[PDB]
Symmetry: C4
Subunit: 364 residues, 4 copies
């Protein structure tokens, strides 16, 4: 039987590196491999974290700043910080309480929770665990069947999703050789997608191949027609992808390379953010992820055109060790680091971060 973390309470860590190492003591080796590794030779995965020092934050002086405020007004939401939970499959790999513990902790921190289509809990359980006022978005892995897609969108609406995130960069799985070496299969059901995917004993290759490969702009139009929720396209890393998305009626862009898990030999997401921000030209909101481990990474992404930054692996490691308490402590780590960076950079508010000018590193 697969046994994940069970602790609910405060965890001891300094940074996200010793947290990642500590989680190896509570997550079974196959599950830890699935969470921790990446595609191919890991060039793109390693570049994600390195890329934040391609651009340098200037520690300005005499900026008349104290008690910097991370409070973020986004649509009709008031977030504690411009930091949100990325959609991550199967939280039962990390903690017995799974998405109930992660939705509760992210609700208590006070920010957006993005639910995965491949969750180990129902969306009804995720909504119940966060509470009725918790801001929640729905990440969509589409079926090949449009009847099933209508049913999943009506289900997202019933559960008060405020946006639909169409993940478009995992039409098939990457060459994840750690999962191959481990013979990884999912241990739990995937109730949200149960009409097309059973989860238990399935390879990640089989799971992604059960979803829709032939995604196109018509899929954005389908979601608009049948849900009337704003659509974010996730995995956007070029101008061409921005224009395809906006022309089809997308109301948000989510810059990502899937945490280096997909196409090895592609760019770091932070480098792609420059190209995407120029193409979007503030027409719609931008979410950014992949490689974020420090407050300075969040600051640099927002200065470079992101409106929100999403957290993946670090949140899952905190969940494994401390449940709702532990995942909230990870969000608090990022908020506390962002407050330090804001004071030393000279930015009183999140809007001031957007107006900061980074220096390109000519000696990387």
């Amino acid at each position: 039987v697969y046994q994940a973390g069970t602790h609910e309470g405060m965890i001891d860590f300094i940074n996200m590196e010793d947290l990642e190492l500590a989680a190896t003591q509570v997550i079974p080796s196959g599950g830890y491999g699935y969470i921790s590794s990446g595609a191919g030779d890991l060039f793109t995965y390693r570049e994600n974290q390195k890329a934040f020092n391609h651009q340098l934050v200037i520690p300005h002086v005499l900026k008349d700043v104290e008690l910097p405020d991370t409070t973020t007004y986004f649509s009709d939401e008031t977030l504690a910080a411009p930091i949100i939970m990325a959609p991550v499959a199967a939280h039962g790999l990390a903690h017995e309480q799974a998405e109930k513990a992660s939705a509760k902790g992210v609700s208590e921190f006070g920010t957006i929770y993005t639910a995965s289509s491949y969750a180990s809990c129902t969306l009804e359980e995720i909504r119940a665990a966060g509470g009725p006022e918790a801001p929640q978005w729905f990440q969509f892995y589409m079926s090949k069947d449009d009847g099933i897609n209508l049913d999943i969108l009506e289900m997202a609406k019933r559960n008060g999703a405020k946006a639909v995130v169409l993940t478009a960069d995992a039409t098939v799985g990457g060459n994840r050789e750690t999962d191959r070496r481990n013979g990884f299969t999912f241990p739990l059901p995937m109730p949200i997608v149960q009409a097309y995917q059973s989860g238990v004993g399935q390879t990640l290759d089989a799971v992604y191949k059960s979803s829709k490969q032939k995604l196109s702009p018509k899929d954005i139009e389908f979601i608009t027609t049948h849900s009337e929720l704003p659509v974010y396209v996730k995995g956007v890393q070029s101008e061409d992808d921005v224009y395809r998305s906006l022309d089809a009626g997308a109301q948000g862009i989510w810059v990502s390379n899937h945490g280096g898990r997909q196409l090895d030999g592609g760019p770091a997401s932070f480098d792609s953010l420059r190209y995407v921000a120029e193409a979007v030209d503030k027409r719609v909101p931008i979410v950014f992820d992949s490689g974020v481990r420090r407050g300075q990474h969040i600051f640099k992404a927002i200065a470079s055109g992101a409106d929100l930054v999403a957290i993946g692996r670090p949140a899952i490691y905190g969940l494994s060790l401390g449940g709702s308490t532990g995942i909230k402590q990870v969000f608090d780590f990022f908020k506390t680091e962002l407050e330090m960076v804001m004071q030393l950079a000279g930015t009183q508010t999140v809007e001031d971060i957007k107006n900061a000018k980074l220096r390109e590193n000519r000696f990387m």
Copy 2:
């Protein structure tokens, strides 16, 4: 007595790195040294594989792609994938069945087999092993004697060669210090070139020095006059070399640095491909090799102007461990990776790969 691999059947590997390591268990150390190493301080050899991340593949989204097709129409041939067997000497160093096993396996995969002038089998055996419908090209190490050169061209014609590949970048051998340390000599005859080279007990320095050093455009004209087969010049890495080749009547260009085995301190072949593709301007087909270990490398070469990509060492390691079955499994590894890359890049067909735009890596 020199004893190579003898197994015929399925081999267990994840990627080309663990395959290269596994082959050390079946190839005698001197033969393994000859296959695996490179010239001088190994700068050029190491740069070949690194250079593929000088250019970054964009994982596009909403591209309306599924079941990408690697089928390649080349002249009157239908290939399984745009992936061919490079000319590699003396397959008897790797497997007892030598070029019979490699020609059979490449025929069964369904692509072009390039026979080496320094083969351990006759071209008659290579044609018989592939079958009459197998696409085969003849790689020519020319004699100093034009009578011998006429005889070798008539022999290539009798065996249904569809092209002659004039290898022009090995007029002498490189400074291969692993072969020097090992006291390497060839253990088998070289029947195709037996009129000028006996093979058995000969150093690689002596073998290359027995062939023609003073290659010139007149040699292309000689091959056209006496065979009426299309001539590819192999080792082309600059505009000057393209113009010298085309002005002399070459009908193909093969971009290579001989797998880093020749002039240490020269460029990586993938970097040279940009210069050669601009000079050729689609006037003749381009074959590309040197350093290819992943589907993403094949995709990037084709996006950068290659029509076909040739495989060297990885195919020989598969041959050593599994014979015809093992070499076909290596071609299947590259085809399966290329299908994954095509889906995630958004390319339905091989012609779509040619139209993909890579992003230059400013932070290598």
Copy 3:
């Protein structure tokens, strides 16, 4: 009880690297951690020392130079070399005689001593130890209370400070994870700031947070109004910061990133010096620090627009091992290396260093 170094006399070292290692034998581990480490992942701290080879010194020939003279005329001062003591807190962490030993040694070398607001001695003791003719500057960590700030400025005047250095890049402490791992607290009082900070048993986070966070140009105007001493702004790394400082009446600019102790992910100070020197355009003097370990680093900073170069950690390591004798030996190491560099570069005097042209390193 905290026990620091006690030796007064000559120390044995080759360079600043073996000196840093030797100091681990006499400084208690918590104090050594506080002195030696830096913020976050240590990118900025490591880049400081690497950055000196971003620009290359040309060893000119036939320059008609011998017995190069480091004598520096600065205001009405005559310095032995263009090399000064940086403000560093709590010298009692390094040596029992603390700032008495460091002020005496720097006075005997014959250069400017910058006293820290967080000193373990009174400014009266620092003035008494240096003697009445010793050039001393006062580094100011301001109170939130303007009455306390007036008292501290009157105290600096009574002790013959010739400049006030407003440190503006430590409004809060950086994420110094070595100090967190060690549970570091200060062992000694901070008498200069005793009206707002007690020092003993306090975290570095608490100490910086007791000083003023909301520094602005109004603070420069306050210091001018109440002391009539020239004001240097310390931590300046951009054109915007130069203009804010000069517009508010600053009479000096001190280029620094606080030895990599503050905002990780920011630039190396030597790289920032180019931007600051262009903005200042010789309107006021420039002091430079962060990463200086060799005479060639001092030469390059002066050629790039610095008038004076400040020494931090290396001086503290020398103090720990040899007291006044040991700190003077560190200044002598830098002067002797600078004389070697001046001879080989072809610069007779310090003004000749300013006119030297470095070559940018295109292959870093």
Copy 4:
């Protein structure tokens, strides 16, 4: 008593790296330290060998080349190859037969021998050992005394020196910390400079400081007036140094950084060669050294504007292990590698090397 190598005969090596290691078995540790190491943190010393791959040699094809000829016509000399012996002090540190063995071996190879002012033999012994037809140049470390300088120039003339090489980049010694750690002193006299320097028991700092520091263009004019031999200025790495040298009547330029032994933090000599070749514009001959370990390095230097390439440490390691036979084997190693590079690059003669175009490495 200092005991150096004594063997006269053939030595076993593959490349200059295993030769450098083998010499540790026959050269006493202090002498080996003096020969092998460099200044400061060894940035410049390490960059010298790395810098050859800043520019890439194109292996051209169909160039109509065989049996490439390294024969070099230089003034009225006929050299075996465009490869000469650099001036290196005190060959008695390496072999008992000292400069007698090195002059004989370089004469038998058939190239220019540059005698050091700090030789362990007289120039009469060096001339006698090479024979009357051996091309020999005299490297001059000048006295502060012009009477002594006239005597040394008349001595060079009597011994048939064909050029005077004024070494201008060692007016003082670099910070050679291996020699400091070892307490190195010279074990033998320096007869050529005996009027001002005794050699025995002297530090390298004392030896360089006994020679002239205040070198200027007047020193070139002095040498022309009193010897009527062509003057080469050694250590030239910039346009300013070329113009100072030529304006003062220099008839040759020797590009060098003294093998990384002098000013750490300066450029690699191969990178400086581009700047110097553009300034010289073929007005006088150029000699190049520092970091040469491969035939490809010699080829690249000549393609980049050198007329001759000088060898230092590798020749001394060969001398230590095999005397005259061993030093000739090192010159033969470089000639044999240069012949391989010429064949693969497509250059029939040394003048053809000068016309080769390298590709700048954009991904170093």
